[PDB]
Amino acid sequence: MALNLQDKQAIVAEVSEVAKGALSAVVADSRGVTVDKMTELRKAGREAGVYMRVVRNTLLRRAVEGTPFECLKDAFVGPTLIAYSMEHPGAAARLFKEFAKANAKFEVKAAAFEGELIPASQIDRLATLPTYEEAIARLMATMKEASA
Amino acid sequence: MFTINAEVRKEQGKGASRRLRAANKFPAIIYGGKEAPLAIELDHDKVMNMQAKAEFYSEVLTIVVDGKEIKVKAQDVQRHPYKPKLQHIDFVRA
Amino acid sequence: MKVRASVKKLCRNCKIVKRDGVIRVICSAEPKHKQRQG
Amino acid sequence: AKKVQAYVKLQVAAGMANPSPPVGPALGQQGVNIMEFCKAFNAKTDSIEKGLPIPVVITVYADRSFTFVTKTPPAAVLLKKAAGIKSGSGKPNKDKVGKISRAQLQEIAQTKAADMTGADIEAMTRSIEGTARSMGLVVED
RNA sequence: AGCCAGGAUGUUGGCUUAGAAGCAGCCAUCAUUUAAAGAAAGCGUAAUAGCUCACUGGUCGAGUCGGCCUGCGCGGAAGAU
C-alpha cells in the first residue's frame, strides 16, 4: 500500500467510470484464474476498444468509495468480492448478456448477478439491450408483396 | 522549535543533584550575556527524547521557567558514563 | 535433543515454549533443532 | 476455451508433418496418434504458410481420435526473421550491439494479436518494446 | 496472525562442468507483463521436473509490533555417615 496519493487514483478511475458510464455487470472473482479474465478481455475488447474495464476492487474504501457520487446502491453489492464492470461509450450493448453467457460456463460466479444501477430494480437478467443499430430488416418484404 | 519546561533549583550541590537524578529529573544551567547564571532542573525523560534528534543541539530552544520564555542554545551535555542518560546540561543564552 | 544453557531459535520453524518450568525449542521442520535448557 | 486437458507444445515442421530425430514418436504416444498428424494438420497448412516452426497442441485423452489445434509464433523469435541478427546477441549481455527498426515493431505484433491482453491495438506494441529490448537492442526510432 | 489466490516473462542468464535448468560453484544481481512475482531464502533432483518461501490481492474487522529503562522471579546448578 502507498499512502493517500495512490489509493485515490483507483477511486478517481472508479468514480469516473461509475459516473461517466452506462449499464454495468458484476463478476464475483472469488478464485480468479488466468483464462477467466482473459476470456472477458476479448469480450470487453469487442465493445469499441478498452472502455469496459473490470478491476478486482471490492473494498469499501475502494470501489465503494465512489458510491456517494454516482451508483448510490453499491453498499449491498460491496461485501465479499464484486468486480463492477462499468461501461462507457454506447449503452448496455451485450455486456449483461455476454456476462450471463460467460458466467454460465462455470466462470467462478457473480453473487447471483447482483447488478449495477440503470433502471429501478436490482437483479434482473434482461435481453432487451442486444439490437441497437439494425436497420435492414424492414427491407426484406418489398419484392415479394407486389405480384399479389 | 523545542520548548523545554523547567523549575528553579532550591538546593544545589552533590547530594541534591544525586537526589534529583534519582527522581527522574536532572540539573542544568543557563549562562550568557549580562544576566546572572540560572540553575534549573529538568524532567529527564522529556529532554532525552528531544536530544535524540540532532536538530536539538543546532537550533535555538526555549526554556520556560517561572512562566518566562528564555531562548537558549545547548552548549554542553554531561552524559552518564555507561547509560542512555543525562547528568547535566549547559545552556547558553541566545 | 540438545540440552544447553543457551537455547535459541535456529530457524524460521523453531518455536520456543516453556513447559513445566523448562525453556524448550520445538521445531516443526528439523528434528535436530529441538532443544531443552539444562 | 474454458477447460484444458493435456498439451505438449514443440517447434515442429509445417512442410512435411513426419519428423523422427526432433519429435516423431515423442510428439504423441500417450493415447495420441502419429497417423492423424499427417491428414488433418496438413489440411489447414496449405492455406497459410509452411516451413517455419509451428507449435501444435493435440487434444487427446483416451478416445484414440483427437482434435488437432493451431497456435501462434514466438514474439521473441519475431526479431530474427523480421528485424536483423537471427541470434539477437552474439556476445555476453554487457555491450549493446543489436538493433531493430522504427518502421517495424508494430505490424509484426498485429499478426499475433490473438494472444495479447492489451485491449488497445497500440497497447500490445508497448509490450513488444520490452521483448525487443531483451538484451538491450537500441532501435533508431 | 491465520485463511483463499497468484508466486509469471527475456530465461534454462552465461560458463566450467560430467551435468548445472533460482539452488555445485564463479559472477552480473539486470530488465519485462505490472497488483506482485528474488537471474532467487529453504526443501527436492541425475538435472530438469516437483514442493514451499519472499513480496502482493482478497476475506476478516481491532488493536498490534519489538526496542529502551528499571522491580521481583526462572534455567545455567553434580559428592561422598
Side-chain angles (χ1 to χ4, degrees):
Chain A
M1 211 293 121
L3 8 57
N4 9 277
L5 358 158
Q6 196 355 61
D7 20 318
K8 293 178 173 86
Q9 153 44 11
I11 289 36
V12 152
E14 246 124 38
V15 176
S16 92
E17 279 200 87
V18 157
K20 305 155 287 149
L23 179 120
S24 331
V26 297
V27 254
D29 295 342
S30 148
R31 259 303 169 44
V33 209
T34 327
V35 143
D36 268 66
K37 239 191 133 120
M38 258 171 219
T39 32
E40 229 180 287
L41 280 206
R42 332 133 126 117
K43 191 308 272 288
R46 277 222 274 100
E47 310 335 305
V50 200
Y51 85 65
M52 240 322 314
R53 291 198 239 124
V54 41
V55 207
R56 270 268 250 100
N57 259 220
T58 179
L59 257 61
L60 277 186
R61 45 243 103 222
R62 185 50 49 43
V64 188
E65 196 94 283
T67 288
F69 242 71
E70 267 40 69
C71 256
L72 199 220
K73 241 110 150 140
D74 291 345
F76 308 117
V77 184
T80 82
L81 239 152
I82 280 286
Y84 309 78
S85 78
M86 332 278 345
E87 254 204 72
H88 264 278
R94 327 110 259 262
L95 264 292
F96 249 3
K97 303 280 295 282
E98 261 114 41
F99 260 76
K101 308 215 158 164
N103 277 141
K105 278 141 196 134
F106 127 127
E107 262 70 275
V108 201
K109 231 137 87 187
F113 253 138
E114 286 221 75
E116 212 63 289
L117 275 126
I118 289 299
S121 297
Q122 21 242 53
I123 139 189
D124 219 24
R125 154 89 9 277
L126 303 176
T128 89
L129 54 87
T131 61
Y132 208 84
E133 214 315 287
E134 227 294 57
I136 207 77
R138 336 201 124 208
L139 314 167
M140 203 259 269
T142 33
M143 207 3 235
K144 274 174 300 180
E145 252 174 323
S147 64
Chain B
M1 185 171 182
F2 292 107
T3 302
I4 303 166
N5 295 94
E7 276 67 35
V8 171
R9 298 187 61 217
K10 287 91 169 192
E11 60 181 39
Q12 296 155 29
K14 180 174 192 177
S17 290
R18 292 279 184 90
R19 283 199 219 96
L20 256 176
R21 297 220 184 76
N24 206 247
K25 292 168 163 194
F26 77 106
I29 193 156
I30 304 155
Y31 62 77
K34 53 136 178 58
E35 192 175 6
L38 174 55
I40 69 279
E41 70 101 347
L42 317 158
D43 188 48
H44 169 255
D45 283 347
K46 292 267 185 171
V47 176
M48 194 64 182
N49 293 320
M50 275 191 208
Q51 77 78 44
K53 300 148 195 170
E55 195 182 46
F56 177 93
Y57 294 110
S58 60
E59 289 202 313
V60 175
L61 315 89
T62 310
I63 296 179
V64 178
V65 57
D66 312 288
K68 188 163 185 171
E69 282 73 291
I70 310 168
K71 310 85 39 74
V72 300
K73 256 192 189 200
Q75 173 89 350
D76 198 50
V77 54
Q78 293 192 14
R79 304 178 172 284
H80 191 259
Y82 64 97
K83 299 177 171 176
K85 259 187 189 181
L86 304 183
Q87 298 293 78
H88 181 260
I89 290 167
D90 275 343
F91 289 118
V92 167
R93 292 203 172 75
Chain C
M1 187 79 80
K2 321 197 184 314
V3 24
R4 291 215 173 107
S6 170
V7 300
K8 296 175 163 167
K9 291 169 184 167
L10 296 182
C11 66
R12 299 174 319 286
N13 304 119
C14 285
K15 296 160 188 169
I16 289 167
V17 55
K18 186 169 170 180
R19 323 181 167 160
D20 198 72
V22 183
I23 306 306
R24 295 167 178 283
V25 177
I26 93 285
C27 188
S28 55
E30 183 51 78
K32 286 188 169 192
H33 289 207
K34 119 177 149 187
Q35 291 156 106
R36 181 213 197 286
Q37 217 182 23
Chain D
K2 40 177 192 147
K3 178 79 184 125
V4 206
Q5 197 124 21
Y7 64 82
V8 189
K9 61 208 79 211
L10 242 350
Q11 278 95 354
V12 299
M16 233 185 139
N18 176 6
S20 176
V23 236
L27 105 79
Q29 191 153 340
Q30 64 232 332
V32 200
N33 222 335
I34 302 298
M35 194 276 308
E36 212 0 56
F37 197 97
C38 39
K39 257 212 241 194
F41 157 55
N42 286 335
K44 235 134 130 119
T45 271
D46 296 27
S47 201
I48 27 190
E49 212 275 316
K50 8 93 116 83
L52 261 41
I54 283 188
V56 72
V57 131
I58 345 306
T59 319
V60 221
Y61 346 110
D63 313 69
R64 198 148 347 164
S65 331
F66 53 58
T67 34
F68 90 115
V69 201
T70 192
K71 263 236 176 102
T72 191
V77 178
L78 271 230
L79 302 142
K80 142 187 348 174
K81 191 235 70 128
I85 307 84
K86 297 209 124 160
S87 78
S89 283
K91 3 257 191 139
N93 195 332
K94 188 110 200 33
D95 346 51
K96 276 31 168 162
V97 168
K99 37 260 207 287
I100 12 178
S101 147
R102 28 83 186 106
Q104 262 129 34
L105 323 182
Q106 168 103 359
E107 261 190 54
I108 328 202
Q110 203 188 331
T111 55
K112 16 194 317 70
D115 303 88
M116 240 288 83
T117 48
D120 227 355
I121 297 196
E122 177 195 341
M124 304 135 31
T125 261
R126 313 223 249 294
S127 50
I128 304 330
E129 296 157 339
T131 309
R133 182 165 350 189
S134 324
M135 170 120 158
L137 320 200
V138 129
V139 81
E140 293 60 28
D141 203 358

mmCIF file with all atom_site columns, all heavy atoms in Angstrom, chain A residues 23 91-97 118-119 124-132:
data_model
loop_
_atom_site.group_PDB
_atom_site.id
_atom_site.type_symbol
_atom_site.label_atom_id
_atom_site.label_alt_id
_atom_site.label_comp_id
_atom_site.label_asym_id
_atom_site.label_entity_id
_atom_site.label_seq_id
_atom_site.pdbx_PDB_ins_code
_atom_site.Cartn_x
_atom_site.Cartn_y
_atom_site.Cartn_z
_atom_site.occupancy
_atom_site.B_iso_or_equiv
_atom_site.pdbx_formal_charge
_atom_site.auth_seq_id
_atom_site.auth_comp_id
_atom_site.auth_asym_id
_atom_site.auth_atom_id
_atom_site.pdbx_PDB_model_num
ATOM 1   N N   . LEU A 1 23  ? -24.753 0.889   -18.523 1.00 0.00 ? 23  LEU A N   1
ATOM 2   C CA  . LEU A 1 23  ? -25.092 -0.450  -17.969 1.00 0.00 ? 23  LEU A CA  1
ATOM 3   C C   . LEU A 1 23  ? -23.806 -1.162  -17.535 1.00 0.00 ? 23  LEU A C   1
ATOM 4   O O   . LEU A 1 23  ? -22.852 -1.202  -18.338 1.00 0.00 ? 23  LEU A O   1
ATOM 5   C CB  . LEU A 1 23  ? -25.834 -1.260  -19.037 1.00 0.00 ? 23  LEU A CB  1
ATOM 6   C CG  . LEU A 1 23  ? -26.231 -2.676  -18.626 1.00 0.00 ? 23  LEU A CG  1
ATOM 7   C CD1 . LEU A 1 23  ? -27.741 -2.856  -18.684 1.00 0.00 ? 23  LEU A CD1 1
ATOM 8   C CD2 . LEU A 1 23  ? -25.538 -3.709  -19.501 1.00 0.00 ? 23  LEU A CD2 1
ATOM 9   N N   . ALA A 1 91  ? -24.147 2.057   -24.628 1.00 0.00 ? 91  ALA A N   1
ATOM 10  C CA  . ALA A 1 91  ? -25.220 1.937   -23.613 1.00 0.00 ? 91  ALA A CA  1
ATOM 11  C C   . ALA A 1 91  ? -25.057 0.620   -22.844 1.00 0.00 ? 91  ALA A C   1
ATOM 12  O O   . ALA A 1 91  ? -24.113 0.515   -22.038 1.00 0.00 ? 91  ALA A O   1
ATOM 13  C CB  . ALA A 1 91  ? -26.570 2.027   -24.278 1.00 0.00 ? 91  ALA A CB  1
ATOM 14  N N   . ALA A 1 92  ? -25.950 -0.343  -23.095 1.00 0.00 ? 92  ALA A N   1
ATOM 15  C CA  . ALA A 1 92  ? -25.899 -1.657  -22.413 1.00 0.00 ? 92  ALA A CA  1
ATOM 16  C C   . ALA A 1 92  ? -25.252 -2.695  -23.338 1.00 0.00 ? 92  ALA A C   1
ATOM 17  O O   . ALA A 1 92  ? -24.630 -3.642  -22.819 1.00 0.00 ? 92  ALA A O   1
ATOM 18  C CB  . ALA A 1 92  ? -27.288 -2.077  -21.999 1.00 0.00 ? 92  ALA A CB  1
ATOM 19  N N   . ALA A 1 93  ? -25.404 -2.510  -24.654 1.00 0.00 ? 93  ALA A N   1
ATOM 20  C CA  . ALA A 1 93  ? -24.838 -3.439  -25.662 1.00 0.00 ? 93  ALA A CA  1
ATOM 21  C C   . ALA A 1 93  ? -25.221 -4.881  -25.303 1.00 0.00 ? 93  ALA A C   1
ATOM 22  O O   . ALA A 1 93  ? -26.418 -5.137  -25.079 1.00 0.00 ? 93  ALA A O   1
ATOM 23  C CB  . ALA A 1 93  ? -23.341 -3.265  -25.743 1.00 0.00 ? 93  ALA A CB  1
ATOM 24  N N   . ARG A 1 94  ? -24.232 -5.779  -25.256 1.00 0.00 ? 94  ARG A N   1
ATOM 25  C CA  . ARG A 1 94  ? -24.489 -7.203  -24.915 1.00 0.00 ? 94  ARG A CA  1
ATOM 26  C C   . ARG A 1 94  ? -23.692 -7.567  -23.658 1.00 0.00 ? 94  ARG A C   1
ATOM 27  O O   . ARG A 1 94  ? -23.549 -8.770  -23.380 1.00 0.00 ? 94  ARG A O   1
ATOM 28  C CB  . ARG A 1 94  ? -24.111 -8.112  -26.088 1.00 0.00 ? 94  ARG A CB  1
ATOM 29  C CG  . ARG A 1 94  ? -24.331 -7.486  -27.458 1.00 0.00 ? 94  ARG A CG  1
ATOM 30  C CD  . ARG A 1 94  ? -23.026 -7.173  -28.164 1.00 0.00 ? 94  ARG A CD  1
ATOM 31  N NE  . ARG A 1 94  ? -22.676 -5.762  -28.085 1.00 0.00 ? 94  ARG A NE  1
ATOM 32  C CZ  . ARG A 1 94  ? -22.918 -4.874  -29.042 1.00 0.00 ? 94  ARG A CZ  1
ATOM 33  N NH1 . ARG A 1 94  ? -23.514 -5.251  -30.160 1.00 0.00 ? 94  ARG A NH1 1
ATOM 34  N NH2 . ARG A 1 94  ? -22.562 -3.612  -28.880 1.00 0.00 ? 94  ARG A NH2 1
ATOM 35  N N   . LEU A 1 95  ? -23.202 -6.556  -22.935 1.00 0.00 ? 95  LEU A N   1
ATOM 36  C CA  . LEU A 1 95  ? -22.404 -6.773  -21.698 1.00 0.00 ? 95  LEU A CA  1
ATOM 37  C C   . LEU A 1 95  ? -23.148 -7.737  -20.766 1.00 0.00 ? 95  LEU A C   1
ATOM 38  O O   . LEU A 1 95  ? -22.607 -8.826  -20.489 1.00 0.00 ? 95  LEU A O   1
ATOM 39  C CB  . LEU A 1 95  ? -22.165 -5.423  -21.017 1.00 0.00 ? 95  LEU A CB  1
ATOM 40  C CG  . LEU A 1 95  ? -20.825 -4.759  -21.333 1.00 0.00 ? 95  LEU A CG  1
ATOM 41  C CD1 . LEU A 1 95  ? -19.675 -5.554  -20.736 1.00 0.00 ? 95  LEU A CD1 1
ATOM 42  C CD2 . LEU A 1 95  ? -20.641 -4.601  -22.834 1.00 0.00 ? 95  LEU A CD2 1
ATOM 43  N N   . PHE A 1 96  ? -24.339 -7.342  -20.305 1.00 0.00 ? 96  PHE A N   1
ATOM 44  C CA  . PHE A 1 96  ? -25.149 -8.189  -19.390 1.00 0.00 ? 96  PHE A CA  1
ATOM 45  C C   . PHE A 1 96  ? -25.332 -9.581  -20.006 1.00 0.00 ? 96  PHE A C   1
ATOM 46  O O   . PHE A 1 96  ? -25.098 -10.586 -19.303 1.00 0.00 ? 96  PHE A O   1
ATOM 47  C CB  . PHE A 1 96  ? -26.496 -7.523  -19.093 1.00 0.00 ? 96  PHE A CB  1
ATOM 48  C CG  . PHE A 1 96  ? -26.660 -7.038  -17.675 1.00 0.00 ? 96  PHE A CG  1
ATOM 49  C CD1 . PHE A 1 96  ? -25.620 -7.139  -16.765 1.00 0.00 ? 96  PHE A CD1 1
ATOM 50  C CD2 . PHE A 1 96  ? -27.855 -6.482  -17.246 1.00 0.00 ? 96  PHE A CD2 1
ATOM 51  C CE1 . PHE A 1 96  ? -25.771 -6.697  -15.460 1.00 0.00 ? 96  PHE A CE1 1
ATOM 52  C CE2 . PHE A 1 96  ? -28.005 -6.039  -15.943 1.00 0.00 ? 96  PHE A CE2 1
ATOM 53  C CZ  . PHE A 1 96  ? -26.962 -6.147  -15.051 1.00 0.00 ? 96  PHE A CZ  1
ATOM 54  N N   . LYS A 1 97  ? -25.739 -9.630  -21.277 1.00 0.00 ? 97  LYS A N   1
ATOM 55  C CA  . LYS A 1 97  ? -25.950 -10.919 -21.990 1.00 0.00 ? 97  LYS A CA  1
ATOM 56  C C   . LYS A 1 97  ? -24.654 -11.735 -21.950 1.00 0.00 ? 97  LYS A C   1
ATOM 57  O O   . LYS A 1 97  ? -24.674 -12.850 -21.390 1.00 0.00 ? 97  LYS A O   1
ATOM 58  C CB  . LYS A 1 97  ? -26.395 -10.662 -23.432 1.00 0.00 ? 97  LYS A CB  1
ATOM 59  C CG  . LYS A 1 97  ? -27.660 -9.826  -23.582 1.00 0.00 ? 97  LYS A CG  1
ATOM 60  C CD  . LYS A 1 97  ? -28.930 -10.625 -23.380 1.00 0.00 ? 97  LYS A CD  1
ATOM 61  C CE  . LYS A 1 97  ? -29.136 -11.683 -24.441 1.00 0.00 ? 97  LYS A CE  1
ATOM 62  N NZ  . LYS A 1 97  ? -29.637 -11.097 -25.708 1.00 0.00 ? 97  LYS A NZ  1
ATOM 63  N N   . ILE A 1 118 ? -29.131 1.040   -13.303 1.00 0.00 ? 118 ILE A N   1
ATOM 64  C CA  . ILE A 1 118 ? -29.561 1.565   -14.633 1.00 0.00 ? 118 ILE A CA  1
ATOM 65  C C   . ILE A 1 118 ? -31.065 1.853   -14.585 1.00 0.00 ? 118 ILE A C   1
ATOM 66  O O   . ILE A 1 118 ? -31.446 3.031   -14.728 1.00 0.00 ? 118 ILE A O   1
ATOM 67  C CB  . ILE A 1 118 ? -29.202 0.571   -15.754 1.00 0.00 ? 118 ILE A CB  1
ATOM 68  C CG1 . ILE A 1 118 ? -27.693 0.513   -16.000 1.00 0.00 ? 118 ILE A CG1 1
ATOM 69  C CG2 . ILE A 1 118 ? -29.969 0.895   -17.028 1.00 0.00 ? 118 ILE A CG2 1
ATOM 70  C CD1 . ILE A 1 118 ? -27.089 1.831   -16.430 1.00 0.00 ? 118 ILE A CD1 1
ATOM 71  N N   . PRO A 1 119 ? -31.932 0.832   -14.388 1.00 0.00 ? 119 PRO A N   1
ATOM 72  C CA  . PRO A 1 119 ? -33.381 1.040   -14.331 1.00 0.00 ? 119 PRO A CA  1
ATOM 73  C C   . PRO A 1 119 ? -33.849 1.461   -12.929 1.00 0.00 ? 119 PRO A C   1
ATOM 74  O O   . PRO A 1 119 ? -33.377 2.467   -12.430 1.00 0.00 ? 119 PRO A O   1
ATOM 75  C CB  . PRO A 1 119 ? -33.924 -0.354  -14.673 1.00 0.00 ? 119 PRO A CB  1
ATOM 76  C CG  . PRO A 1 119 ? -32.891 -1.300  -14.100 1.00 0.00 ? 119 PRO A CG  1
ATOM 77  C CD  . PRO A 1 119 ? -31.566 -0.576  -14.228 1.00 0.00 ? 119 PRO A CD  1
ATOM 78  N N   . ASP A 1 124 ? -31.986 -8.621  -12.372 1.00 0.00 ? 124 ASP A N   1
ATOM 79  C CA  . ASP A 1 124 ? -32.952 -8.937  -13.458 1.00 0.00 ? 124 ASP A CA  1
ATOM 80  C C   . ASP A 1 124 ? -32.201 -9.066  -14.789 1.00 0.00 ? 124 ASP A C   1
ATOM 81  O O   . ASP A 1 124 ? -31.955 -8.024  -15.430 1.00 0.00 ? 124 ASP A O   1
ATOM 82  C CB  . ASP A 1 124 ? -34.063 -7.888  -13.540 1.00 0.00 ? 124 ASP A CB  1
ATOM 83  C CG  . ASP A 1 124 ? -35.434 -8.479  -13.826 1.00 0.00 ? 124 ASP A CG  1
ATOM 84  O OD1 . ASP A 1 124 ? -35.632 -9.670  -13.518 1.00 0.00 ? 124 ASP A OD1 1
ATOM 85  O OD2 . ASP A 1 124 ? -36.290 -7.742  -14.355 1.00 0.00 ? 124 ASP A OD2 1
ATOM 86  N N   . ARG A 1 125 ? -31.854 -10.297 -15.177 1.00 0.00 ? 125 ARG A N   1
ATOM 87  C CA  . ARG A 1 125 ? -31.127 -10.547 -16.451 1.00 0.00 ? 125 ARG A CA  1
ATOM 88  C C   . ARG A 1 125 ? -32.085 -10.321 -17.628 1.00 0.00 ? 125 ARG A C   1
ATOM 89  O O   . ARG A 1 125 ? -32.862 -11.243 -17.940 1.00 0.00 ? 125 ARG A O   1
ATOM 90  C CB  . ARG A 1 125 ? -30.558 -11.968 -16.473 1.00 0.00 ? 125 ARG A CB  1
ATOM 91  C CG  . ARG A 1 125 ? -30.374 -12.544 -17.871 1.00 0.00 ? 125 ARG A CG  1
ATOM 92  C CD  . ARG A 1 125 ? -29.011 -12.221 -18.452 1.00 0.00 ? 125 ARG A CD  1
ATOM 93  N NE  . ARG A 1 125 ? -28.124 -11.622 -17.465 1.00 0.00 ? 125 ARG A NE  1
ATOM 94  C CZ  . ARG A 1 125 ? -28.119 -10.333 -17.142 1.00 0.00 ? 125 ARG A CZ  1
ATOM 95  N NH1 . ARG A 1 125 ? -28.956 -9.501  -17.735 1.00 0.00 ? 125 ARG A NH1 1
ATOM 96  N NH2 . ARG A 1 125 ? -27.277 -9.884  -16.230 1.00 0.00 ? 125 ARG A NH2 1
ATOM 97  N N   . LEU A 1 126 ? -32.024 -9.136  -18.245 1.00 0.00 ? 126 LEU A N   1
ATOM 98  C CA  . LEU A 1 126 ? -32.909 -8.800  -19.394 1.00 0.00 ? 126 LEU A CA  1
ATOM 99  C C   . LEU A 1 126 ? -32.102 -8.868  -20.697 1.00 0.00 ? 126 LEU A C   1
ATOM 100 O O   . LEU A 1 126 ? -30.894 -8.556  -20.661 1.00 0.00 ? 126 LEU A O   1
ATOM 101 C CB  . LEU A 1 126 ? -33.491 -7.399  -19.180 1.00 0.00 ? 126 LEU A CB  1
ATOM 102 C CG  . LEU A 1 126 ? -34.267 -7.206  -17.877 1.00 0.00 ? 126 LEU A CG  1
ATOM 103 C CD1 . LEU A 1 126 ? -34.707 -5.757  -17.721 1.00 0.00 ? 126 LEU A CD1 1
ATOM 104 C CD2 . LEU A 1 126 ? -35.466 -8.137  -17.817 1.00 0.00 ? 126 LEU A CD2 1
ATOM 105 N N   . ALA A 1 127 ? -32.754 -9.262  -21.794 1.00 0.00 ? 127 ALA A N   1
ATOM 106 C CA  . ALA A 1 127 ? -32.089 -9.370  -23.114 1.00 0.00 ? 127 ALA A CA  1
ATOM 107 C C   . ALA A 1 127 ? -32.617 -8.275  -24.048 1.00 0.00 ? 127 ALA A C   1
ATOM 108 O O   . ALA A 1 127 ? -32.574 -8.474  -25.279 1.00 0.00 ? 127 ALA A O   1
ATOM 109 C CB  . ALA A 1 127 ? -32.316 -10.745 -23.693 1.00 0.00 ? 127 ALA A CB  1
ATOM 110 N N   . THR A 1 128 ? -33.097 -7.167  -23.473 1.00 0.00 ? 128 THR A N   1
ATOM 111 C CA  . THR A 1 128 ? -33.639 -6.034  -24.272 1.00 0.00 ? 128 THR A CA  1
ATOM 112 C C   . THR A 1 128 ? -32.600 -4.909  -24.329 1.00 0.00 ? 128 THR A C   1
ATOM 113 O O   . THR A 1 128 ? -32.997 -3.733  -24.197 1.00 0.00 ? 128 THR A O   1
ATOM 114 C CB  . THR A 1 128 ? -34.973 -5.542  -23.694 1.00 0.00 ? 128 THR A CB  1
ATOM 115 O OG1 . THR A 1 128 ? -34.691 -4.539  -22.717 1.00 0.00 ? 128 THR A OG1 1
ATOM 116 C CG2 . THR A 1 128 ? -35.786 -6.652  -23.065 1.00 0.00 ? 128 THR A CG2 1
ATOM 117 N N   . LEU A 1 129 ? -31.328 -5.259  -24.547 1.00 0.00 ? 129 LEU A N   1
ATOM 118 C CA  . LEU A 1 129 ? -30.236 -4.247  -24.614 1.00 0.00 ? 129 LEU A CA  1
ATOM 119 C C   . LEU A 1 129 ? -29.289 -4.577  -25.774 1.00 0.00 ? 129 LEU A C   1
ATOM 120 O O   . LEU A 1 129 ? -28.389 -3.757  -26.047 1.00 0.00 ? 129 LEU A O   1
ATOM 121 C CB  . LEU A 1 129 ? -29.486 -4.237  -23.279 1.00 0.00 ? 129 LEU A CB  1
ATOM 122 C CG  . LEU A 1 129 ? -28.965 -5.594  -22.805 1.00 0.00 ? 129 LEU A CG  1
ATOM 123 C CD1 . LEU A 1 129 ? -27.585 -5.876  -23.380 1.00 0.00 ? 129 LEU A CD1 1
ATOM 124 C CD2 . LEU A 1 129 ? -28.932 -5.662  -21.286 1.00 0.00 ? 129 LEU A CD2 1
ATOM 125 N N   . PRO A 1 130 ? -29.481 -5.793  -26.547 1.00 0.00 ? 130 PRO A N   1
ATOM 126 C CA  . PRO A 1 130 ? -28.780 -6.621  -27.858 1.00 0.00 ? 130 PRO A CA  1
ATOM 127 C C   . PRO A 1 130 ? -28.784 -5.809  -29.161 1.00 0.00 ? 130 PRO A C   1
ATOM 128 O O   . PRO A 1 130 ? -27.732 -5.339  -29.557 1.00 0.00 ? 130 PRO A O   1
ATOM 129 C CB  . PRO A 1 130 ? -29.571 -7.926  -27.987 1.00 0.00 ? 130 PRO A CB  1
ATOM 130 C CG  . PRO A 1 130 ? -30.151 -8.094  -26.612 1.00 0.00 ? 130 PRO A CG  1
ATOM 131 C CD  . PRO A 1 130 ? -30.604 -6.696  -26.248 1.00 0.00 ? 130 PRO A CD  1
ATOM 132 N N   . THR A 1 131 ? -29.956 -5.665  -29.785 1.00 0.00 ? 131 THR A N   1
ATOM 133 C CA  . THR A 1 131 ? -30.090 -4.897  -31.052 1.00 0.00 ? 131 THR A CA  1
ATOM 134 C C   . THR A 1 131 ? -30.206 -3.401  -30.731 1.00 0.00 ? 131 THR A C   1
ATOM 135 O O   . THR A 1 131 ? -30.999 -3.054  -29.833 1.00 0.00 ? 131 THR A O   1
ATOM 136 C CB  . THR A 1 131 ? -31.296 -5.382  -31.869 1.00 0.00 ? 131 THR A CB  1
ATOM 137 O OG1 . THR A 1 131 ? -32.471 -5.179  -31.083 1.00 0.00 ? 131 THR A OG1 1
ATOM 138 C CG2 . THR A 1 131 ? -31.189 -6.838  -32.267 1.00 0.00 ? 131 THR A CG2 1
ATOM 139 N N   . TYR A 1 132 ? -29.447 -2.562  -31.442 1.00 0.00 ? 132 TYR A N   1
ATOM 140 C CA  . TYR A 1 132 ? -29.471 -1.091  -31.214 1.00 0.00 ? 132 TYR A CA  1
ATOM 141 C C   . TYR A 1 132 ? -28.824 -0.373  -32.403 1.00 0.00 ? 132 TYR A C   1
ATOM 142 O O   . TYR A 1 132 ? -28.223 0.701   -32.199 1.00 0.00 ? 132 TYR A O   1
ATOM 143 C CB  . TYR A 1 132 ? -28.755 -0.745  -29.907 1.00 0.00 ? 132 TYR A CB  1
ATOM 144 C CG  . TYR A 1 132 ? -29.245 0.511   -29.230 1.00 0.00 ? 132 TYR A CG  1
ATOM 145 C CD1 . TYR A 1 132 ? -30.350 0.489   -28.395 1.00 0.00 ? 132 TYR A CD1 1
ATOM 146 C CD2 . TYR A 1 132 ? -28.604 1.723   -29.421 1.00 0.00 ? 132 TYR A CD2 1
ATOM 147 C CE1 . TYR A 1 132 ? -30.805 1.638   -27.767 1.00 0.00 ? 132 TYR A CE1 1
ATOM 148 C CE2 . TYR A 1 132 ? -29.046 2.880   -28.802 1.00 0.00 ? 132 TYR A CE2 1
ATOM 149 C CZ  . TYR A 1 132 ? -30.150 2.839   -27.972 1.00 0.00 ? 132 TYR A CZ  1
ATOM 150 O OH  . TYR A 1 132 ? -30.593 3.974   -27.358 1.00 0.00 ? 132 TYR A OH  1
#
